[PDB]
């Protein structure tokens with residue numbers, strides 16, 4: 001029985017390598033990675049790969065791996081797929097730990113914008129979880145942490161992390177990670193998957209996919225939001241993406257809203273993530 005080597009970048013930046021049968025469905029690999037991570041609350045997570053166009057794609061666990069990666073390498077990343085709106089409701093601390101690792105990368109990458117003070121507060125909880133209580137012996141007036149906290153590090157940010165870290169004496173790792181998540185979950189771009197698009201007039205917008213629905217970002221002035229329960233049907237056709245909205249009270253007709261995506265693959269990608277979010281957060 002012929003087996004393919006898989007490589008998976010884990011959220012701590014390490015590599016997990018395993019072999020699966022070449023006709024294996026995505027679930028086979030995902031189960032091996034989750035067992036490696038001692039992760040039981042698996043439903044929030046998934047594997048991504050990079051396509052022939054270098055776009056991030058979710059590996060569909062119900063479909064053959066080979067039919068997805070096609071001509072590319074069996075190289076994947078382990079990621080959060082569904083960001084829980086209330087991380088305190090997760091059963092296990094280790095689930096919150098992996099969600100923290102994802103969010104740290106969302107911040108450093110700049111996908112999750114964050115004020116100076118929130119960058120410092122999140123960094124201070126991470127340090128507290130991983131190193132424990134503040135130690136002046138580890139940090140002089142000129143201290144720079146090995147921890148990546150932000151898309152652009154400054155000395156002022158390092159100092160503020162230390163100042164807040166001093167205030168967390170006696171905090172345990174699960175406690176610190178829960179505080180991290182209580183702050184992170186409030187950020188306006190928390191768990192938002194952003195997609196470049198044009199409206200039915202050709203104006204550049206962003207479509208954001210998240211627990212609370214589909215967000216349209218026209219710019220700092222005018223942001224529309226469609227809660228998932230208001231959405232009856234998501235479709236795509238060529239480069240176009242459409243949402244069918246429930247009729248409003250006393251309105252005779254449903255309303256269909258149309259967007260232009262970069263190409264057909266990008267319309268299909270957006271359709272699939274919206275459908276998956278709609279289903280997940282309907283049931284969660």
Ligand SMILES: N#Cc1ccc(CNCc2ccc(F)cc2)cc1
Pocket residue numbers: 007008009015075076
């Ligand atoms: N410079 C340099 C340099 C960078 C990376 C590596 C090893 N990368 C392994 C790896 C590949 C694909 C994958 F998905 C997971 C892990 C070695 C040297």
